[PDB]
Amino acid sequence: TIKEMPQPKTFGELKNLPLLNTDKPVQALMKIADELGEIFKFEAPGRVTRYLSSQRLIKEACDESRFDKNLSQALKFVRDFFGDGLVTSWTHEKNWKKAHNILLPSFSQQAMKGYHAMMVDIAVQLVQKWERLNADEHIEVPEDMTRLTLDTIGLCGFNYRFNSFYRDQPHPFITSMVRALDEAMNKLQRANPDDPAYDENKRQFQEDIKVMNDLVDKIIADRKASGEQSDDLLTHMLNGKDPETGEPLDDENIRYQIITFLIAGHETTSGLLSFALYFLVKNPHVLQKAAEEAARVLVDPVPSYKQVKQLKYVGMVLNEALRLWPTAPAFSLYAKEDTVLGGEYPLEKGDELMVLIPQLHRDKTIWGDDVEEFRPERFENPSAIPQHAFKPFGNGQRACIGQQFALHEATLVLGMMLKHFDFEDHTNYELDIKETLTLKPEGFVVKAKSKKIPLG
Ligand code: HEM
Ligand SMILES: Clc1ccccc1C(c1ccccc1)(c1ccccc1)n1ccnc1
């Protein structure tokens, strides 16, 4: 029977908006979902979203005959930067399907086998950094994972070396992007955007845009000028033709894809590796099991592609980390036509739904009562997981194109970490989840005692 949709508390003309006046809006939305259940309406001035949290409703929203990928408010905002790249394009935009067809071969098994050696290059730099620490020095986990994941996408994707392990501070490209996005957001909150007090902000913004454009120019120019032509993501961007049309990407779209992939390729994976290490050091029985697997499988000085595929329990650790804290914590959908969701909630054409992935992943009707515990064995039998219960990589044709890249990199790196070191949660770290568009365990630190096993 038709039901009235719960809605949290309203503040006059501001509606629900100031419930998100917090540095942890996703964690706030989870608490609302705890109070109101599987679906709730959330209104801001001029905007309406419905937040879904149950597998039963999310399964229906994932029916692509009824619902398509929506560009949420955050996606429409970052579209100013990522244009009609794969992430920030509508499914019905010609450049989506075209780039999808051209770039999908960059994530084939053959391509993955080709990325493996370059992933090992960066993973070795990570291990060697930690091997080289003096006594009593600790590791800043998310910081080092970010160094790794940035360098991995740069190298595997574009043959560009960020050399993040040679720097104290983040690469200027990252700093520029962060500061440009922060400025663009601050702009929207300024009562008087033409106040001369903001002149320096505007000048800084142009400089930051130029840092980003200079890197994209260099990545393209160095490839075109090189004697080596390689076979990577950039190769397909520059040369690949859409089989449906015979056309290659145009120059403008290529530039959007490059920055799209540089950003997509690193920060969500960095958080995954950080959360996985967090859970491991908090669950010493799981850590021992994972470490036993790493020692038994990784019998050569550097892992091979096939050995990474054999790290089954490491893979389950990573899925269980993505269950609890999926590092892209939502994706957005809209109703293609008028329709009724769950036989209970009528929707008009165009209505937006937000999939609240952390809350999906805590649906007790699917996972049982222990949803807050870290138990990788939940994934021991993959056929037992109902479809649409586990969605850290989105849905359908708009699912993450890089999912296998991310997981292969993370499995490789976590395996090598577990082979080469014993880890200590020397501060008894208290989980504090810092939110941007992603999630990270802020201030997570550990010590790594080397097992003195040499690399190749
Ligand atoms: C743990 C790591 C990752 C997570 C959690 C993640 C998550 C997601 C999710 C949820 C989407 C769907 C977005 C939406 O529906 O609006 C998505 C799309 C995408 N991801 Fe990822 N991602 C990860 C890693 C990567 C990596 C390593 C790359 C690139 C090498 C990548 C590139 C993309 C692209 C290009 C899309 C857009 C696909 C399309 O619609 O054509 N992601 N990702
Ligand atoms: Cl937001 C964004 C912009 C450009 C590329 C990728 C992504 C996205 C993401 C999410 C959180 C923090 C940084 C990037 C993302 C966009 C929309 C919905 C989910 C994730 N992403 C990273 C990996 N795959 C997709």
Author numbering: 1 to 456
List sentences quoted exactly from the publication behind this structure.
Among the bacterial P450s, one of the best characterized enzymes is the Bacillus megaterium CYP102A1 (P450 BM3), which Armand Fulco’s group identified as a fatty acid hydroxylase that could catalyze the hydroxylation of saturated fatty acid substrates, primarily at the ω-1, ω-2, and ω-3 positions. P450 BM3 (BM3) is a natural fusion of a cytochrome P450 (N-terminal) to a FAD-, FMN- and NADP(H)-binding cytochrome P450 reductase (CPR). More recent work in our group has used the double mutant (DM) form of the flavocytochrome P450 BM3 enzyme (F87V/A82F), in which the first mutation expands available substrate binding space in the active site, while the second mutation is more distant from the heme but causes a structural readjustment in the P450 that alters its conformational state. We also report the first structures of the BM3 DM heme domain in complex with four different azole drugs, confirming the greater plasticity of this variant and its ability to structurally adapt to bind to several azole drug compounds.
The crystal structures of the BM3 DM heme domain were solved in their complexes with the azoles clotrimazole, voriconazole, fluconazole and tioconazole. In so doing, the azoles ligate to the ferric heme iron of the WT heme domain through nitrogen atoms. This occurs through imidazole nitrogens for clotrimazole/tioconazole, and through a triazole nitrogen for fluconazole. For all the azole-bound structures reported in this study, the hetero-aromatic nitrogen ligand is oriented so as to fit within the groove of the I-helix formed between Ala264 and Glu267/Thr268. The voriconazole, clotrimazole and tioconazole structures contain multiple monomers in the asymmetric unit, and in each case the general protein conformation corresponds to the “open”, substrate-free conformation of the enzyme, with little significant difference in protein or ligand conformation between monomers. With the exception of the heme-ligand interaction, most contacts established with the protein are of a hydrophobic nature. In the case of clotrimazole, one of the most hydrophobic ligands, two additional 2-methyl-2,4-pentanediol (MPD) molecules derived from the mother liquor were observed to interact both with the ligand and the protein. As binding titrations and EPR studies were conducted without MPD or similar compounds, MPD is clearly not needed for azole binding. However, X-ray crystallographic analysis revealed single occupancy of the azole ligands for each of the structures solved.
